[PDB]
Amino acid sequence: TILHSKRANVYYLQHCRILVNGGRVEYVTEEGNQSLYWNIPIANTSVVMLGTGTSVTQAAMREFARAGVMIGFCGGGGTPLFAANEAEVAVSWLSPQSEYRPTEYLQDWVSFWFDDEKRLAAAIAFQQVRITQIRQHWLGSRLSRESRFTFKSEHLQALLDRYQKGLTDCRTSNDVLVQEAMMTKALYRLAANAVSYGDFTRAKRGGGTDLANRFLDHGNYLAYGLAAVSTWVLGLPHGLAVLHGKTRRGGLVFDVADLIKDALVLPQAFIAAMEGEDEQEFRQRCLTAFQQSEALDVMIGSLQDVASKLSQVV
Amino acid sequence: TILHSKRANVYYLQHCRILVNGGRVEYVTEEGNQSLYWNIPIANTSVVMLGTGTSVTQAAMREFARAGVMIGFCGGGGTPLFAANEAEVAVSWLSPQSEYRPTEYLQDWVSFWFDDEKRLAAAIAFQQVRITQIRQHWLGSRLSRESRFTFKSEHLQALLDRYQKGLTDCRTSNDVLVQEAMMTKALYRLAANAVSYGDFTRAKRGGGTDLANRFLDHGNYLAYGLAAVSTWVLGLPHGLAVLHGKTRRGGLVFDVADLIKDALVLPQAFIAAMEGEDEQEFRQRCLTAFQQSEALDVMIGSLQDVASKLSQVV
């Protein structure tokens, strides 16, 4: 068995049937009247996301679970699986139930999760990790090699420090959501100007037509799958959220994705937009950034730190 | 026949493709499967497990997500549980716009689990249910039809009465572990003698070559898999055991499986060993025992009874 943070494969599949053929897990594409079989290395895979036109068999789900592979059904193309006027389910997660997870972090989590103040402290602690991650990867060596992404370091520093001070003034979870909105709005403008994108407004409803909004939508679901693996590895149920629980099902997946979403996905979205790339080329950018930045380790390590900080065990 | 739990509305499906036709969920069953899956309410009260020979499309998962129907994948006959949606714990501070039905049992469980005295009462309550199940199903109609398994009912009564007296003297978790080990050693001897097996030593770590230990290993797998179904539908995590050590992975699943394991699996393993049966034949003996003894409902009901009795909420 390979450790999840060492697994190198994240899959996003559409228009194919996933079954077991000769004991091996394969996804079958039917472009034409000929079927094509593609092997999935589940031992080296952490998460497989299933979009439009996908199906899975029970035998395939058996192998996924035994290998500890998180399976999620999403809407495809950056859309939620189920969308309504206010109702929305982003991803239906099929968590493996057969590979027993450690217990210590779960006991730490439930020991404080029902305290309103301790849940607020966890949410702030997530945003502080988010600030650290943005400062690190927006100014690091990997992104400096991208000559297309040019911005004034003082502008980002003033932004992160303004958000850092705003978090201390927060007293409710809604206060933090307001500060996150202000910070993310200025951060979108900074990333847009960094690539000479021109005018940009984030399509919060997911109905954006420009390449930046489309890539930001798709990049979020890539981050969701990585966050779903992080909470599972530590035996944390997706429903024990700290910030985005009061609106969305599977909230902790969204909270944990925020740890690396703006730091890794956001710059790659605007870069790929100005390069005129398709979805797969932008997908390879996010996946590579996830590997090289050890994004899975960041989410797992952040949850472990927060769990021990707020634990109420003796 | 397809309703595996009356308490949780858990339906088991096999040999059918689940898809969406004309905006409706439809079940394309193989000719020969004369089950009635169209009668399953597509509402948040229903739990659907997909067994042997099933498949599901992304479009059907969307409908299940819209209706709040939890989907799970299991092995043949309803065990083991492979992968499944998670049941979220919604309090007043986690109000999502999803039709899923949240479980109150997780908050009930956490409200007493950290109290060492309350955690002990739950463990003793489990062993009481265990005593009842052994008493009931070792002397019931189904097992009396087995001519190979012959024993004097007084021996079983005295064995169980001895263990019940020991439980009332226990004051710590370790006291219960010592009493259980004595009862279990005596019960395994009673079973081995009931079939005239001869020498029997329970091989830990799955390292037994004799048919008795092998069948006992396989039957534990089927019991743990069924217990995973009970914690899944109640939204209880595996890491909150009541008798097993707090650091033991999957401890709660093992505790829940102990409610019915010795009552149902233990006699069948020694019978099948003495009859020289194979894996598939012994697996059928266990499934039949689970179904006729309502093992899933016993586990679901016991967790509910302990949860409501020991809860500290409101």
Swiss-Prot record, chains A, B:
One GO molecular-function entry: metal ion binding
Regulation: induction: Expressed in late exponential phase (other phases not tested); part of a large cas-CRISPR3 polycistronic operon.
Industrial or biotech use: If the spacer DNA has a perfect match in the chromosome then toxicity results. Suppression of the toxic effects occurs via mutations in the CRISPR/Cas machinery, or via target deletion, which might contribute to genome plasticity. This CRISPR/Cas system can be used to remove genomic islands, and possibly other genomic regions.
Keyword Transmembrane helix: no
Enzyme kind, highest EC tier: hydrolase
Catalytic activity, EC: 3.1.-.-
Xref: InterPro entries: CRISPR-assoc_Cas1 (IPR002729), CRISPR-assoc_Cas1_C (IPR042206), CRISPR-assoc_Cas1_N (IPR042211), CRISPR-assoc_Cas1_YPEST-subtyp (IPR019857)
Entry annotated with the keyword Metal-binding: yes
Swiss-Prot/TrEMBL keywords: Antiviral defense, DNA-binding, Endonuclease, Hydrolase, Magnesium, Manganese, Metal-binding, Nuclease
Co-factor(s): Mg(2+); Mn(2+)
Pfam families: Cas_Cas1
Any Gene Ontology biological process: defense response to virus
Binding site for Mn(2+): E180, H244, D258
Purpose: CRISPR (clustered regularly interspaced short palindromic repeat), is an adaptive immune system that provides protection against mobile genetic elements (viruses, transposable elements and conjugative plasmids). CRISPR clusters contain sequences complementary to antecedent mobile elements and target invading nucleic acids. CRISPR clusters are transcribed and processed into CRISPR RNA (crRNA). Acts as a dsDNA endonuclease. Involved in the integration of spacer DNA into the CRISPR cassette.
Subunit text: Homodimer. Interacts with Cas3, in the absence of crRNA.
Similarity comment: Belongs to the CRISPR-associated endonuclease Cas1 family.
Name listed for the protein in its UniProt record: CRISPR-associated endonuclease Cas1
Organism phylogeny: Bacteria, Pseudomonadati, Pseudomonadota, Gammaproteobacteria, Enterobacterales
Gene: cas1
